[PDB]
């Protein structure tokens, strides 16, 4: 079934994907803290910061990634940022959701001072990943695949990045044939979602303009990773 080295690499990616969590302090606030546009928003900012924290730490561990040129490491990180976050978010919302929590989070998201035109496609996409009751390793691999696009802007050496993404794609494909042997389109169904995930790069870039009214000045990490002002 799975090559000896492919498994050597899949273990390596799991040992980084499963290392990281959303903190107690943060998931409590979803229950604990008071409700309103100000506090609900203020919570979402903390989560988003947490995802960048987690994104980064995942990224640095991806095998090969340290050999990449420093500028290209940055480019990748900022390019993949928004997609990685929508993807972590979904799977925080679909799997690590004591059901009461995820309902309260839905309420809080829908009264965050953010508008439907953004909220609705987010929840759409969640539900869409919902079907394909994705597994632990499916998310870790996609995330690594999303992070290592040769497609992103400002990369010098696309060839080096392509050669890092391709082993991973193989592993995934060979993974679909093992946990979904009855359904041979599965691997495609996945990258189909990976396409509607890139839709969100426009949503995000727009959404910064809309909400930048009322002057937040997000925490330093979101400031730097989203590249605002």
């Amino acid at each position: 079934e799975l090559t000896p080295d492919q498994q050597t690499l899949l273990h390596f990616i799991m040992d980084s994907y499963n290392k990281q969590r959303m903190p107690q302090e943060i998931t409590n606030k979803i229950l604990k803290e008071e409700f309103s546009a100000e506090e609900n928003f203020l919570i979402l900012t903390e989560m988003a910061t947490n995802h960048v924290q987690v994104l980064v730490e995942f990224t640095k561990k991806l095998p090969g990634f340290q050999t990449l040129d420093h500028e290209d490491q940055i480019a990748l990180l900022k390019g993949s940022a928004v997609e990685a976050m929508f993807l972590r978010s979904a799977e925080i919302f679909n799997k690590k959701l004591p059901s009461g929590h995820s309902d309260l989070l839905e309420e809080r998201i829908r009264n965050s001072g953010i508008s439907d035109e953004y909220i609705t496609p987010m929840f759409s996409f969640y539900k869409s990943i919902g079907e394909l009751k994705m597994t632990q390793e499916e998310y870790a691999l996609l995330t690594a695949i999303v992070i290592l696009s040769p497609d992103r802007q400002y990369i010098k050496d696309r060839e080096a990045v392509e050669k890092l993404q391709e082993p991973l794609l193989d592993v995934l494909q060979k993974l679909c044939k093992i946990h979904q042997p009855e359904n041979p389109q599965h691997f495609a169904c996945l990258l189909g979602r990976l396409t509607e995930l890139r839709t969100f790069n426009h949503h995000h870039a727009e959404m910064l303009m809309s909400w930048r009214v009322n002057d937040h000045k997000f925490t330093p990490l979101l400031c730097e990773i989203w590249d605002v002002q």
Partner: peptide, 11 residues
């Protein structure tokens, strides 16, 4: 240069 991200990637 992005000091914050270099900082986090090299930690």
């Amino acid at each position: 240069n992005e000091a914050l991200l270099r900082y986090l990637l090299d930690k």
